[PDB]
Amino acid sequence: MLTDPIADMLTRIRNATRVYKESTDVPASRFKEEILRILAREGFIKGYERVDVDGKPYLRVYLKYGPRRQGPDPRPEQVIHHIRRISKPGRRVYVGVKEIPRVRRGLGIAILSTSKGVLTDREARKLGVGGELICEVW
Amino acid sequence: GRYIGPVCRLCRREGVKLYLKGERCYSPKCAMERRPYPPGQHGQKRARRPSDYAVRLREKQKLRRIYGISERQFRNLFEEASKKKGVTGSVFLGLLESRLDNVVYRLGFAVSRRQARQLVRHGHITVNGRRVDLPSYRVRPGDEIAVAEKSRNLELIRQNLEAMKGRKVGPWLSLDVEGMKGKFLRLPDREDLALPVNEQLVIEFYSR
Amino acid sequence: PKKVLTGVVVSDKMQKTVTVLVERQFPHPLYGKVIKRSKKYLAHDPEEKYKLGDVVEIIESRPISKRKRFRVLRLVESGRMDLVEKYLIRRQNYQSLSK
Amino acid sequence: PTINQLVRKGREKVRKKSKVPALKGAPFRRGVCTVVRTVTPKKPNSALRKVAKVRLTSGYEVTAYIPGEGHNLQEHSVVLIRGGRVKDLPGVRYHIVRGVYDAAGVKDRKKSRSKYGTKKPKEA
Amino acid sequence: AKEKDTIRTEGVVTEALPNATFRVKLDSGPEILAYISGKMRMHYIRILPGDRVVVEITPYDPTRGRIVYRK
Amino acid sequence: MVKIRLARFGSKHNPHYRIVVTDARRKRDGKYIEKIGYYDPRKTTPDWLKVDVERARYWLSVGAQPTDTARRLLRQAGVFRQE
RNA sequence: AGCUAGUUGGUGGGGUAAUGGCCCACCAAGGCGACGACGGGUAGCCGGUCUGAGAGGAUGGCCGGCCACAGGGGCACUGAGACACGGGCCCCACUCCUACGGGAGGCAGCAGUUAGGAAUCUUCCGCAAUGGGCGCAAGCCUGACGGAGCGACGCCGCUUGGAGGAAGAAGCCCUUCGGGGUGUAAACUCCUGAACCCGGGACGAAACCCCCGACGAGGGGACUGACGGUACCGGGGUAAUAGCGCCGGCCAACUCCGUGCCAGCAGCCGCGGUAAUACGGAGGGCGCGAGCGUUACCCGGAUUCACUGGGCGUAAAGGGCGUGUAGGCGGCCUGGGGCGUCCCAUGUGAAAGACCACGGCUCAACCGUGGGGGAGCGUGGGAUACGCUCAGGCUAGACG
């Protein structure tokens, strides 16, 4: 059994983005989906769409990368330089509104699960709610 | 008790002209003239490249010695600026500039820093109609620093203000010469002070 | 407010009394993982109404005896011995790990 | 280690042992000499190091080093221990105070006089 | 200051103890521990266990001595 | 007996009293029930006595007793005036 | 690693202000423990304090709040209240009186003594102020308190002079013997005037009391100093304590002589075995200054017990393997509940401290006023993504 499907999803993408894969597939889940919405909304991925692979529903996640660079190692600068799961099973992380962090001095994001929905660190801070600090992304 | 002794021997150790002698730091006798090397046996010897700690240590000493203050007052004065809101650098300077004895010299009352220190110490300075004899008195903006009417007839006082006729005073300052008055208009800014010191070095000296 | 807790009966062997086990969820004060702590309460059953395994509510009460300050309020869930099974076996494991 | 583990067993603070059992944790401790000796050093150095077995008020018999060029500490003379170890002498974990009950300061000491317990001379 | 209570009494080596150590038996009285002087060791100079040697003794401990004269 | 008195919060040669409600059985510098004013005997500030009379009048209605000095300052603030 | 006999529970009784195995009887056979029972060690606890970027580590002196003890142990009486420091009864050890029969004691109250100890004060003034006991009051008691004394113990303010003054005295130190250094530093010119002398000389004080009014409101009137002739103001007035550590690097400051693995320095790495910037002195220099160095101890550096924020192929570290118990962890869909979680309200978070502001001692330390914060816990209300839960549905995991 897969333990932490979100962490697997983030790691699917973390592995996907380092070999510069066009797309990778992750098992479909409404929470996973509500996560990818923030990512496509925030411009970290090109986007996503549902897909059935051998009859099983997935999420085609299309990654994005910067410009091809100059001499040795012309491999483009990453768009998602960092992704880290935070509120893991067996060590759960919850923040209040005041306990919301400032990722990368504001240049990053922090995806929050709140009773009002899945939100970015800015989104919940202007909403004035807290919850499960799921992950840093930047 | 502050430092008492040879003054123009520390004009050379810092490498920059320090006018704590008052006069004779301007006439060709300062010992900064034709003698800019540090004192002692090994002054004229070639000096090695100072360490990073050496650079900040001297910058603090170059500033502390200018005002004539012991390190104990000097250090605690600095710690105040860090707690107070604003840039720690220029905040500290205005605090030194707000010392009563410094204001006496700044207003051109005294020849030197040490002279202003003794002028205040012997109670000759009036602040808003009240005599004050503490050189470490913090002058507020608007305070009236005047000369005691008892001492307005002292020939040393009329001596200095005779050379003050026509001399300009600090932008944050203003004095009445015939009445021997003077007012602390504002805390001086960084650009108000012509001090040959880099504040950031001294601040970095205290991060350790 | 008199404090009120919900637990399970784990001992019926006494007279006019029943032992009640109450779980508590709370995050760790440094490691922040949610941790499960339990506490046994001696509850008063004046009519021997409640039986082993019944899920009951308890209330802060005027002391009955040494080690008795809670009265049984009402039945929440009737007779779930799966919770009893967990309690007894943890007690029974202690028969090893002695010598 | 796992968070579950750290919950179950947790860290163990590191207990620091006192390098100076001058008991009661006292800054100093007075005692009487038992011997006054000269001990040879460890490998890198060679000299005759004046030390003294001392019987202390705490109830300890430990070695104490005698600083300075020359001393008057005798078999039964009373002294006060400072602490601090002589690097090149094994087992000598404490120093000796010059300027104390039966221990006099170094004569004609002119550079470091706070150390070695000597007064201030006069210049005519 | 270099106190001048040192002596230059003579003796005979007895034992060949480890690390430049001997049991030099003074002609005057008893034997001491008698480690070798540094000048001698820098100049090497092997000392057999039956040599006549000169000993430097500080009165602060007559139990110890220093072999100054090589043979 | 609940009593209304002064507690010395000043420094040496600079007294400063906190007019206070406390039980007489407590230390004069002990914990009190309610701070109901301050007194400066040296008169070194223009405002050297504040009372909040309508709060002081409450504690009297339940049985608090002032000291002869405490009664002096309350009357000075017109706690007792009834016109 | 197992503990428990009033031990756990019951009925009834005794008791107390009052619940209660608090005690008694009788009945039942229980209660606790790996979520750390029992046993051993240590320890008053907090408000806070110290440190630290912080999470945290440490501590609990003074001050404030609670607990406990009053030479040790036990006991009760009186009382609203004690099982009572300066009340009582008894056992024990001790000091003292003793007519040997028997008695009196209790500073962990203020000072003071002795012991130990590295070490910690005056056998002070005073009831003027605030507070407390009694009293109609007058007033009485108060080693609570307010002051003074001693101690650089801490903090803080202040002095040992300012200006003029030689391309530069004497002395010391170094030298390429030309000179360089101590250095405007001394002398000395001129000005000021710490101490000290003289007079004036406080606030802290206003009530209780008296009188008018009805012993009220209100008004009016009178006494009242320890500190102390102190603080402060006015006047006179003399150039008038500087010490301590360091100078091989970390770490800022260098030369000469002495000494030759010696004498010694040393926090660490290390110097010295004939030129030593490391040892000892001198000159010079660096650092602080009525202080300056050392040891002990705490924190930091230490990310070196790693929640923030470490690791286990070879550096310290995968259990020799399996099964499996407890525990921890949990795939996709839907729904109820809302325990965790989040939000708002509210009560609370004493004062002091800490933080911002203003103000009072000529500044400061200190002190006053006002402001704001704060986790946590109580309560009421709301949200349901996630975690939990109950119900159903699935087939990607697991099994067949």
Ligand SMILES: [Mg+2]
């Ligand atoms: Mg601030």
Ligand SMILES: [Mg+2]
């Ligand atoms: Mg600042």
Ligand SMILES: [Mg+2]
């Ligand atoms: Mg201006």
Ligand SMILES: [Mg+2]
């Ligand atoms: Mg820091």
Ligand SMILES: [Mg+2]
């Ligand atoms: Mg039963």
Ligand SMILES: [Mg+2]
């Ligand atoms: Mg009962």
Ligand SMILES: [Mg+2]
């Ligand atoms: Mg068992």
Ligand SMILES: [Mg+2]
């Ligand atoms: Mg262990």
Ligand SMILES: [Mg+2]
């Ligand atoms: Mg009290």
Ligand SMILES: [Mg+2]
């Ligand atoms: Mg009135």
Ligand SMILES: [Mg+2]
């Ligand atoms: Mg019985």
Ligand SMILES: [Mg+2]
């Ligand atoms: Mg009963």
Ligand SMILES: [Mg+2]
């Ligand atoms: Mg439990």
Ligand SMILES: [Mg+2]
């Ligand atoms: Mg349990």
Ligand SMILES: [Mg+2]
């Ligand atoms: Mg104890």
Ligand SMILES: [Mg+2]
């Ligand atoms: Mg840290």
